[PDB]
Design a protein around this nucleic acid. Structure first.
Lengths: 187, 204
DNA sequence: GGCTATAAAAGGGCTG
DNA sequence: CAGCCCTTTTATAGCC
């Protein structure tokens, strides 16, 4: 691990990265639909071709403006990589693909404290940051001060930390909340 | 928008039998979610419902989301959503909701005696005290406990009868019930009666 | 399976 | 006519 950086001794495993990239070229979704084959375009529900590729297992939403969105990648670089492969596809279809403006927009990651948690004590103690309605969702939606990431503590110890643009914010969240989780460990 | 909103609030209140207290407080909440609003495109009677939800609970007497909805039209979703929005807006929060919170009402609609109520209420607390039902919704636990209690008395009610009033589903009630059944003995009151004894309670 | 919940981008849609 | 919603991903999990 690296107790200097992950004092908890647990390092959140990244689970889904969402990045956007602007191809510049105005796309013909109608066209792109007809030959892509790994795509899926339905003007009906969603106004964007939905193409997917094996390795890295990602999914892209492509709009007739050049703007693409890559989701599913389990890593930035991988999100980036796949985003290139999409452009090269659009490119190999007859379009002026340009990899302008690529950016990481959200890093979803998960974790396991390995001990059950007394959510109510946490929901009660961090009133300002927690929302725990078993009636609406079985998780305690915690909203961290800094960084501005949302965690979703559960009774089992599994954590889910969303909202990060930089994988390190993800780490800064967990280490922040870990000694709160430990305090409310189930007896 | 506001006055006519209160027109409906009262209608809501009445249908589910709410006295002046929460019925007034819900208007006071609603008037504020107009001043200290930020509830923009939200239904005015969604802001209302949620208010007559955050109200019942602040009065120490809450009813399930399903209960408000069944006097509302605005989905459980929206009342769940504007509810969250409203607490944040107004910088306020509530108290959690527990086993012995719906026991009074659930039992009255179920038409059971004080005997059954008390035991269900003691079972549910020990179910939790004994951590027998880890991540179960308190409503579920309660409806479960109410089934153990009642089934061990004369005045019994079925899972479809309990589920129907608790606002849960037999499947779900079965889930918690079966989780607490193995501790049935340690869960009852002690001085509990017993038209049917524990060794006889439905295993489920 | 489905629903509910969290974050995030894209452009059009429906609207209080 | 600012504001949410649709669509796609992912971890997680109780209720239907």
């Amino acid at each position: 691990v690296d107790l200097s950086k992950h004092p908890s001794g647990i390092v959140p495993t990244l689970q889904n990265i969402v990045s956007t990239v602007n191809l510049d070229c105005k796309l013909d979704l109608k066209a792109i639909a007809l030959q892509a084959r790994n795509a899926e375009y339905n003007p009906k529900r969603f106004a964007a071709v939905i193409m997917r590729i094996r390795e890295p297992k990602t999914t892209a939403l492509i709009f007739a403006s050049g703007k693409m969105v890559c989701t599913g990648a389990k890593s930035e670089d991988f999100s980036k990589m796949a985003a290139r492969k999409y452009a090269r596809i659009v490119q190999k279809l007859g379009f002026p693909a340009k990899f302008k403006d690529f950016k990481i927009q959200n890093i979803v990651g998960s974790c396991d404290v390995k001990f059950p948690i007394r959510l109510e004590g946490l929901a009660y103690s961090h009133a300002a940051f927690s929302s725990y309605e078993p009636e609406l969702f079985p998780g305690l939606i915690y909203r961290m001060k800094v960084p501005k990431i949302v965690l979703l503590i559960f009774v089992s110890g599994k954590i889910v930390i969303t909202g990060a643009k930089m994988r390190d914010e993800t780490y800064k969240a967990f280490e922040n909340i870990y000694p709160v989780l430990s305090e409310f460990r189930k007896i | 928008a506001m006055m006519n909103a209160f027109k409906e609030i009262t209608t809501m209140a009445d249908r589910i039998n709410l006295p002046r207290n929460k019925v007034d407080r819900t208007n006071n909440l609603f008037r504020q979610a107009y001043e200290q609003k930020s509830l923009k495109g939200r239904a005015n009677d969604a802001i209302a419902s949620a208010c007559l939800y955050i109200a019942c609970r602040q009065e120490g007497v809450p009813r399930t989301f399903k209960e408000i909805c069944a006097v509302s039209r605005i989905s459980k979703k929206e009342i769940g959503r504007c509810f969250k929005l409203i607490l944040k807006a107004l910088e306020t929060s509530v108290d959690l909701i527990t086993t012995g919170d719906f026991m009074s009402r659930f039992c009255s609609n179920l038409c059971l005696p004080k005997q059954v109520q008390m035991a269900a209420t003691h079972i549910a607390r020990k179910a939790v005290e004994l951590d027998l039902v880890p991540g179960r919704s308190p409503i579920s636990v309660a409806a479960a406990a109410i089934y153990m209690a009642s089934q061990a008395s004369a005045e019994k009610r079925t899972q479809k009868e309990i589920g129907d009033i608790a606002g849960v589903a037999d499947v779900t009630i079965r889930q918690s019930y079966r989780l607490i059944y193995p501790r049935a003995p340690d869960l009852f009151p002690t001085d509990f009666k017993f038209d049917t004894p524990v060794d006889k309670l439905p295993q489920l």
